Amino acid sequence: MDRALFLAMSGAKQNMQALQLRANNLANVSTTGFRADLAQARSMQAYGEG
Amino acid sequence: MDRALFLAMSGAKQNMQALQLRANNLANVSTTGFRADLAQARSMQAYGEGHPSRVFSMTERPGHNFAQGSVITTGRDLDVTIEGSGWISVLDHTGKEGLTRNGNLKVDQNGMLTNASGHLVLGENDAPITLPIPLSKIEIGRDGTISVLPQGAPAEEFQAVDRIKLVKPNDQSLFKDTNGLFRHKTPNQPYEADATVSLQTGAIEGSNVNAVGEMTALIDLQRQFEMQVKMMSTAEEMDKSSDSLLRM
Amino acid sequence: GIPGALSNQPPADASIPQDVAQM
Amino acid sequence: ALSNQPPADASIPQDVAQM
Amino acid sequence: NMVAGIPGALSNQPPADASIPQDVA
Amino acid sequence: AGIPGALSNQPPADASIPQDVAQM
Amino acid sequence: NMVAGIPGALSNQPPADASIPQDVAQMKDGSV
Amino acid sequence: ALSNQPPADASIPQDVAQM
Amino acid sequence: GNMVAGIPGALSNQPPADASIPQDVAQMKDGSV
Amino acid sequence: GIPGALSNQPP
Amino acid sequence: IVESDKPLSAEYNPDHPLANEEGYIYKPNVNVMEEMANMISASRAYQTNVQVADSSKQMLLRTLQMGQ
Amino acid sequence: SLFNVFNVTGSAMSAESVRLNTTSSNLANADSVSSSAKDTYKARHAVFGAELSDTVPVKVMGIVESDKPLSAEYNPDHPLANEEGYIYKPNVNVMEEMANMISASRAYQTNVQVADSSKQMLLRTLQMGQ
Amino acid sequence: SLFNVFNVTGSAMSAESVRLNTTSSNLANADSVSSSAKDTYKARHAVFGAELSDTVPVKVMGIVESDKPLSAEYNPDHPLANEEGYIYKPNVNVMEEMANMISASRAYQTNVQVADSSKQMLLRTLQMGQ
Amino acid sequence: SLFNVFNVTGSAMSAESVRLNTTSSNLANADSVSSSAKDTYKARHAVFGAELSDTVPVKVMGIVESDKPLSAEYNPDHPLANEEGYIYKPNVNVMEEMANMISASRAYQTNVQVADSSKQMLLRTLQMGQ
Amino acid sequence: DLQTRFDRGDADVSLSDVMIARNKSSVAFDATVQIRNKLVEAYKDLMNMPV
């Protein structure tokens, strides 16, 4: 079918991974000498014909 | 094929137009001095030879809701709201006088008193109101009188400079123009400056859109739209069936 | 004929003496 | 039913008074 | 003598809609 | 031509003029 | 030559997401 | 349109400088 | 005469208590007219 | 032959 | 064509331009349920008369072929 | 002369075909903002004609653009907008395009039946006296 | 002809697919501060255009980026923060993408009906002669 | 030879049905730590293939597991915990399995349409001449 | 010509016109066959006459 199904799936999958990184931050609020982890998303384009 | 396809299509098209008319009111709930537009349907019979069975329905704007809007107290000197019924005379960018209800006034660098939309506000002289440039205290009177204080002048120097032109014509003779300014339906008709209308200074008049009234209109427009669509479907269904007559 | 049947012609009305008078 | 005069065109007036 | 006009939905609605060009109508 | 600010799908090279877009 | 690979979700991903095994990604070019 | 050679694949790099 | 007539459809197939049919048309059904 | 394919027989 | 004798449904729209002295406006007495039944009944009645005419058309043709 | 019905039914088939092509273009270009405000797409409609100087063929007299005003939209983000942030869109009404699709298809297939039945009458004429 | 409808409607099917994919990339990059290609992604739009060249197919003439300024957010401790400390994020507007998502799907499905409508007319046109 | 089409569509449906069962086993084992064979379940993915060199059937050449690491969970009191108290779970991703379920179903149904449409062409050829 | 123009893939030819064209040619040739058979039957009738 249309490739927008996987284009959105590849975005929803990363949001869960970003959610995991934030979950590790909140689990480590009481931890001693813990440096918080930053989460960011990188935009990568599929270069080619079209 | 049966002319009932177009009779139902013309009704379904108009129901969309009335839906868009109600949509503009909901998009303009927070607009200042906004009069909600009324929507209705008119039955126009197709007079001619044959049985009188075909009547079209087209939507129209019979009028506007001229009720008092929701007043917002801002504690600002240059904010005024019309008490009861009335209008404020303003001229748009085309220099054409039109009635407004947006009392969110402001003063530009040259001193001319404009509103939030940039329309110059008229006065007693029927010319746009101009204030002295270096003011110190601007108070709008309840009857529209504008009294200003020169820069550095003592308290006992509250001299009046202009009077806001308040017009109260018949609400049934006013139509909303292409830029939201209500004008007389009859052209070249002067706007008489009324002295009975009053301004509640320090407050802003909101829109009078009845949100429930629009929502219940929406649900009725949807159902009537869908029923006519079924009429279109059954019109072509009958046409397809009445095609085996020539199918020898 | 059927009583109360509608007509397929504009309905002679009031304003414009023209209709109020001509049968 | 057949006739010699062509059938008249329908009106569908917006307002009957305007005519 | 000719009889011309736009067929379909654009002509089967009251003239107050004003969709057909004046010249064509 | 048409739109004036259309993009180019080719990877940036900075040396070759992109011919994917209608460069006129 | 024969071309092949995993279809669906795994392949419709950027190469950085190493879901596809390395040797299977090789097959996606050409083989004989 | 059509062509006599297969079209190239699509590049999705995490850093365009390395292609 | 001896002609039977009336409104067809859903309007006629109701008890006469509804009184949604004009009395002129309602007698016309009988057959007297 | 797909390198490293799973099999369908008890290990 | 004869109009229905049901009373017009009066609605309280006092701010409407067409409101009477009591603030009521009147709307057509069209009932949705009976109009939908007419849509179903008229369409099914229309299609079954085509069936009779088509069947009757065949019977005339077989009469022409009678004897030969 | 021997096929007058075919020339009329066939003309309708060609006439109704153009109306379907015009409908397809109107629906496919209902959201084509294009550029400027006068080059914007406008709903096109064929004009049927009948010259009654027997049989009166139906002739398409050219495609005519609709006179409906363009649908204005406020969008001061599209780079092809204007001073007030408005993009004018084609005056294509979906409901009237759907009705034309229904009317064109049914009327086109009706003339197929007439043309097909016309051939049968011609074939039966050849069997006269046999 | 009726086959031209397939080319015209088929072009719209591809056209609405391009806008759907563009919207998908907009929704997936609404919160992406970084990007390969050294460019903070900006909202992209597919600008349709009627290729008049009767039958008027619709073509995508190129993808155009949004003109709205990027959303600046004060994140001084981020490695991508400037001297003032603001990081910039794409100007993707969620509401317009949802509206584009609805419009693209509705326009895509109504092009299927026209192709289906033209298909039946050709099949009946073939039954003539049998 | 439209009978070759039935082989291609028939092989396609077999390939899509294999992927669906693979997706079914992934959803059923997204939380399974143990196994019959003493090795943690890894997400499975059937490998499609094409012998391009007319009609090229799609063939499944085997099931290949994903190489992503098993998701470790800190469950120190679990009987299967390692020296550091971590138990390992399959790397099944829920979002990517739902897309495979949607893709496998749609790809399955569109091959039925091709097979049915190709069936009509063969039957129409049988009527040629006769 | 209209059959092969539409069959080769020319987009300026309508299926309706092609079907019209082959409908008329088929009817026209069928009329030709009927006249031919009557001419031959008359000649065959003519040769079987007393003379």
Short mmCIF file of C-alpha atoms in Angstrom, two decimals, chain M:
data_model
loop_
_atom_site.label_atom_id
_atom_site.label_comp_id
_atom_site.label_asym_id
_atom_site.label_seq_id
_atom_site.Cartn_x
_atom_site.Cartn_y
_atom_site.Cartn_z
CA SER M 1 -12.53 9.72 -24.21
CA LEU M 2 -13.58 7.75 -21.14
CA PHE M 3 -10.03 6.39 -20.93
CA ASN M 4 -8.76 9.94 -20.46
CA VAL M 5 -10.76 9.95 -17.21
CA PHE M 6 -8.51 7.16 -15.93
CA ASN M 7 -5.43 9.26 -16.68
CA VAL M 8 -6.98 12.35 -15.08
CA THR M 9 -8.39 10.58 -12.02
CA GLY M 10 -5.27 8.42 -11.69
CA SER M 11 -3.13 11.56 -11.61
CA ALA M 12 -5.20 12.89 -8.70
CA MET M 13 -4.76 9.57 -6.89
CA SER M 14 -0.99 10.02 -7.13
CA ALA M 15 -1.34 13.74 -6.35
CA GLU M 16 -3.23 13.16 -3.10
CA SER M 17 -0.72 10.44 -2.19
CA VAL M 18 2.13 12.97 -2.42
CA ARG M 19 0.32 15.36 -0.07
CA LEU M 20 -0.40 12.50 2.35
CA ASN M 21 3.28 11.53 2.51
CA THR M 22 4.30 15.18 2.94
CA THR M 23 1.86 15.49 5.85
CA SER M 24 3.21 12.27 7.37
CA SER M 25 6.75 13.69 7.31
CA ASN M 26 5.42 16.91 8.85
CA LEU M 27 3.75 15.09 11.75
CA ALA M 28 6.88 13.00 12.36
CA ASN M 29 9.20 16.05 12.39
CA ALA M 30 7.16 18.47 14.52
CA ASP M 31 9.52 18.00 17.50
CA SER M 32 12.86 17.29 15.78
CA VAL M 33 15.39 19.92 16.83
CA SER M 34 18.23 18.25 14.89
CA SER M 35 18.37 17.07 11.27
CA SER M 36 20.89 15.52 8.85
CA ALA M 37 21.67 18.01 5.98
CA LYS M 38 22.42 20.86 8.46
CA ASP M 39 18.87 22.28 8.06
CA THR M 40 16.24 22.59 10.84
CA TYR M 41 13.33 20.88 9.02
CA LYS M 42 10.57 23.31 8.09
CA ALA M 43 6.99 22.39 7.28
CA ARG M 44 6.64 21.21 3.69
CA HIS M 45 3.61 21.63 1.45
CA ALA M 46 2.70 19.98 -1.85
CA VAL M 47 1.44 22.65 -4.25
CA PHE M 48 -0.87 21.15 -6.86
CA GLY M 49 -1.14 22.59 -10.34
CA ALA M 50 -3.42 22.06 -13.32
CA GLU M 51 -1.39 21.04 -16.37
CA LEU M 52 -3.83 22.28 -19.02
CA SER M 53 -1.50 21.00 -21.81
CA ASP M 54 -11.68 19.09 -21.74
CA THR M 55 -9.25 16.88 -19.80
CA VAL M 56 -7.01 18.71 -17.32
CA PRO M 57 -4.74 16.42 -15.28
CA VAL M 58 -3.34 17.59 -11.95
CA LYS M 59 0.42 17.46 -11.36
CA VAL M 60 2.65 18.12 -8.37
CA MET M 61 5.09 20.83 -9.48
CA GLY M 62 7.39 20.49 -6.46
CA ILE M 63 7.29 20.56 -2.68
CA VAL M 64 7.42 24.02 -1.08
CA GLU M 65 8.48 24.80 2.49
CA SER M 66 6.50 26.84 4.99
CA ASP M 67 7.14 30.58 5.28
CA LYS M 68 6.34 30.76 9.00
CA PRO M 69 9.29 31.54 11.30
CA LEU M 70 10.72 28.65 13.28
CA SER M 71 9.54 28.29 16.88
CA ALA M 72 12.35 29.51 19.13
CA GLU M 73 12.63 27.96 22.59
CA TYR M 74 15.07 28.99 25.33
CA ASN M 75 17.14 25.88 26.14
CA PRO M 76 20.50 27.30 27.24
CA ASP M 77 22.05 24.00 28.38
CA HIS M 78 21.37 22.18 25.10
CA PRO M 79 24.45 21.48 22.93
CA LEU M 80 22.63 23.07 19.95
CA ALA M 81 21.86 26.26 21.88
CA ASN M 82 23.17 29.50 20.40
CA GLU M 83 24.90 32.23 22.41
CA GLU M 84 21.53 33.60 23.55
CA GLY M 85 20.56 30.03 24.46
CA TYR M 86 17.58 29.47 22.14
CA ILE M 87 17.08 26.24 20.19
CA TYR M 88 14.81 26.33 17.16
CA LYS M 89 12.11 23.81 16.27
CA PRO M 90 10.16 23.25 13.03
CA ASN M 91 7.13 25.44 12.30
CA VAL M 92 4.83 22.45 11.77
CA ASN M 93 1.25 23.36 12.65
CA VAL M 94 -0.61 20.28 13.89
CA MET M 95 -4.11 21.55 13.07
CA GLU M 96 -3.39 22.16 9.39
CA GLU M 97 -1.80 18.71 9.05
CA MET M 98 -4.91 17.09 10.53
CA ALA M 99 -7.06 19.18 8.18
CA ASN M 100 -4.78 18.22 5.28
CA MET M 101 -5.00 14.58 6.39
CA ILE M 102 -8.81 14.70 6.24
CA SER M 103 -8.96 16.61 2.95
CA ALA M 104 -6.39 14.38 1.23
CA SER M 105 -8.28 11.23 2.24
CA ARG M 106 -11.67 12.64 1.21
CA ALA M 107 -10.35 13.85 -2.15
CA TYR M 108 -8.56 10.54 -2.76
CA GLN M 109 -11.73 8.48 -2.26
CA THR M 110 -13.93 10.67 -4.47
CA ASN M 111 -11.46 10.19 -7.33
CA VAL M 112 -12.05 6.44 -7.01
CA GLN M 113 -15.77 6.93 -7.67
CA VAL M 114 -15.09 8.79 -10.93
CA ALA M 115 -12.77 6.03 -12.13
CA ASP M 116 -15.41 3.47 -11.16
CA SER M 117 -18.11 5.51 -12.90
CA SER M 118 -16.10 5.69 -16.13
CA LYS M 119 -15.38 1.95 -15.94
CA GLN M 120 -19.08 1.05 -16.11
CA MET M 121 -19.63 3.34 -19.11
CA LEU M 122 -16.86 1.60 -21.05
CA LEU M 123 -18.22 -1.86 -20.22
CA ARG M 124 -21.67 -0.89 -21.48
CA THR M 125 -20.10 0.68 -24.58
CA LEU M 126 -18.48 -2.76 -25.23
CA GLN M 127 -21.81 -4.65 -24.75
CA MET M 128 -22.98 -2.70 -27.86
CA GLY M 129 -22.02 -4.84 -30.90
CA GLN M 130 -22.52 -8.17 -29.05
#
